[PDB]
């Protein structure tokens, strides 16, 4: 009863992605296909085969014939990016195969833009203190984060997060720097610093100013 | 034509049975069938099983038979799946899916093109803890925010304004400290005119710990 598609495949922009789906029920049933994209629900995009739901663009299609559908992408864009699930219908049974990772090359560099807060009064006047360095719209999605104090590296109290997708396609990432609010007011200045694709780039913040 | 909405995300201990309810607005539960699909993290989509209220019965995935039990209510046009015996294995995104019955007969295919906006089941012996809130004060556009401090399980959400404010929001994934708990920000870019005249609230939500804060964000000083 299982559904075979491919783990992965890539597409220039432009270009015609197509993912098979093969499977005993797909033959006599009907294949489905889904694009999720990172952090949504699944959405269908194909039904019956080769019917599109309202509101699905044309690019979009599908066909089967033996055992095996397909799922055809004209026109790849980095908004098509997602993983695809082809699903059967038999008995009284839903199937979903594997998914398919789609990957669209040729996206241009972007470097990284940094918001960084300082602790909050009210933090403070619970006696913490955490500094926040939020990282977005980034690509590719590999940075590595470092704090400072005063010119120093801080080692203790850094919390950071692995890159992750935005909707727009470019990455995002956050750290986070614990602090008592008398080291934070002991300094002059504390920075955020983010190395991406061989350079860095930093966002600074002071007690006063 | 028809909108499915879950229940809350909640934390479970191992042993214990999770309930996730799927009611349909705008439209008849019993026009459809519902089905029940889940997404452990970074992982593929699986079938638990799935009902047709009109016929009144259910169908289970053969790996969740006698584990997994799925109803619904008529009366309140809901729908249900239960999980027992939870493990860790069974921390997920679960999602109701409708499809018309009508064509299920008459075309013999699904079409599932109506999806619940899912619900995370966390299985953990670590015990719920709502998060503390903070603003973070914004200093052409300026950013601002709110802090989402020290809970577990995951998940939050954060809107602004009541919802009223979506254009300009970035609720970021949160971080896993060393500590075991999960903090994130949510960050709204607006104008800097603005600032001082229109009011930015956020409100939290974490569903497994029944916390709800708003937090008004304003200006330094």
């Known amino acids: 009863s299982v559904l075979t598609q491919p783990p992965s495949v890539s597409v220039s922009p432009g270009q015609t992605a197509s993912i098979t789906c093969s499977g005993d029920?797909?033959?006599?049933?009907?294949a489905s296909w889904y694009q999720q994209k990172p952090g949504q629900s699944p959405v269908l995009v194909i039904y019956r085969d080769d019917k599109r739901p309202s509101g699905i663009p044309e690019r979009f299609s599908g066909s089967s014939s033996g055992n095996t559908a397909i799922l055809t992408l004209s026109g790849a864009q980095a908004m098509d990016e997602a993983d695809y699930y082809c699903q059967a219908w038999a008995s009284t049974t839903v199937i979903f195969g594997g998914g398919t990772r789609l990957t669209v090359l040729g996206q241009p560099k972007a470097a990284p833009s940094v918001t960084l807060f300082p602790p909050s009064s009210e933090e403070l006047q619970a006696n913490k203190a955490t500094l926040v360095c939020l990282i977005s719209d980034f690509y590719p999605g590999a940075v590595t984060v470092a704090w400072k104090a005063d010119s120093s590296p801080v080692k203790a109290g850094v919390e950071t997060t692995t890159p992750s997708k935005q909707s727009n396609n470019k990455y995002a990432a956050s750290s986070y720097l614990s602090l008592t609010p008398e080291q934070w007011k002991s300094h002059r200045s504390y920075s955020c610093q983010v190395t991406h694709e061989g350079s860095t780039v930093e966002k600074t913040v002071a007690p006063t100013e | 034509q028809v909108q499915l909405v879950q229940s809350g995300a909640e934390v479970k201990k191992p042993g214990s049975s999770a309930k996730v309810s799927c009611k349909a607005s705008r439209g008849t539960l019993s026009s459809y069938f519902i089905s029940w699909v889940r997404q452990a993290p970074g992982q593929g989509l699986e079938w638990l099983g799935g009902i047709t209220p009109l016929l009144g019965t259910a169908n289970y995935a053969q790996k969740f038979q006698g584990r997994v039990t799925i109803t619904a209510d008529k009366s309140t046009n809901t729908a249900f799946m239960q999980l027992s015996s939870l493990t860790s294995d069974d921390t997920a995104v679960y999602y109701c899916?409708?499809?018309?019955?009508?064509?299920?007969?008459?075309?013999?295919?699904?079409?599932?093109?109506?999806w619940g906006q899912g619900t995370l089941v966390t299985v953990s012996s670590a015990s719920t803890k709502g998060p503390s809130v903070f603003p973070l004060a914004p200093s052409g556009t300026a950013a601002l925010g709110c802090l989402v401090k020290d809970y577990f399980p995951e998940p939050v959400t954060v809107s602004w304004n009541s919802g009223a404010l979506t254009s300009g929001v970035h609720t970021f994934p949160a971080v896993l400290q060393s500590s075991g708990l999960y903090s994130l920000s949510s960050v709204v870019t607006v104008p800097s005119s603005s600032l001082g005249t229109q009011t930015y609230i956020c409100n939290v939500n974490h569903k497994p710990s029944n916390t709800k804060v708003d937090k008004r964000v304003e200006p330094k000083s």
């Open positions: 899916a409708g499809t018309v019955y009508y064509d299920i007969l008459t075309g013999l295919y699904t079409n599932f093109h109506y």
């Open positions: 029920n797909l033959r006599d049933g009907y």
